[model samples]
Target: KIPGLKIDQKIRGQMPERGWTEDDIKNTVSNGATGTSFDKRSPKKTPPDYLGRNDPATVYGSPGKYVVVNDRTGEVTQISDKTDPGWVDDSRIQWG
Candidate 1:
């Protein structure tokens, strides 16, 4: 999953299924957002079913966007339109 850091629809697939309320989307877009760089150097744990494996990704919050980047080439290899709990969980836990 982390081999090339590619972005695909898989990012949106793993979360427990639920519906988003208008307020949720509104706050997600209008609230303060954060971005952080992720890399292969981070520690690895047993992989999750939904996330599979992730690459060096730059996780963004608020107006949710998720991206996977090339650490060496500095190019974006993948992007996500919606937010993933997997990302938010890791973001909050890993660097908070």
Candidate 2:
């Protein structure tokens, strides 16, 4: 649950007998809807039959690599690997 999005109450009404498609589940979730009723006991639990994991995959066959930058100095560094690397000069790094 990201900030500012409200879960839709009609998802349960639209659930297919066999289940929902990937696109159907995505659209519903992105629009702040869940496929199951809300439960307070387990606030973080998803529905028993969540359509799929929402992890982003690497694009095409591209290598999974990224860079970081120091906003004040404008110095960039390749973040191929780092053990809890801290920001250099309070810079913000953006990854696609």
Candidate 3:
């Protein structure tokens, strides 16, 4: 019982009761009355969580692998475990 709750009873009596963002009802009411697009349409990959701070990371690929040295532009993770002790502030990261 929630197709957006009948979209204000099917398009707010012919739209315009506020800046309609149901894709502005496919362009101000009845461009096929589709409603709901709130568009950001891509460019939001969402991977960045361990944004390796203060640079200088070590440990390479095994025996405590590391290289969590992010250089912006998102999504490139390969952690071998334990990353957040507030990302271990220092000590060249070689934690076993």
Please give the lDDT score for candidate 2: 0.26
Per-model lDDT: 0.36, 0.26, 0.27
Q: What lDDT tens digits, residue by residue, belong to model 1 across residues 1-96?
A: 133333233323332232333343334324332454554422232123232234444443332343434345333333433535443333421222
Estimate, for each residue in 1-96, the C-alpha lDDT of model 2 and write its tens digit. 223222232333333431433344334334432122112112222234333233211111112222222222222212222223442311222222
Q: What ranking emerges by lDDT with the best candidate at the front?
A: 1, 3, 2
Give the per-residue lDDT digits (tens) of candidate 3, residues 1-96.
112222323234323432234443323222221111111112232223222333222222322222222223211112323323333323334344
TM accuracy, model 1: 0.26
Residue 28 displacement (Å), model 2: 0.7
Model 3 backbone overlap count: 1
Strongest candidate by TM-score: 1
Model 3 C-alpha lDDT versus the unseen true structure = 0.27
TM-score of each: 0.26, 0.19, 0.16
Candidates' RMSD to native: 9.3, 19.6, 22.5
* Top lDDT model: 1
Pairs that collide, model 3: 22-36
Where's the lowest-lDDT run of ten residues in candidate 1?
42-51
- How high a TM-score does candidate 2 get? 0.19
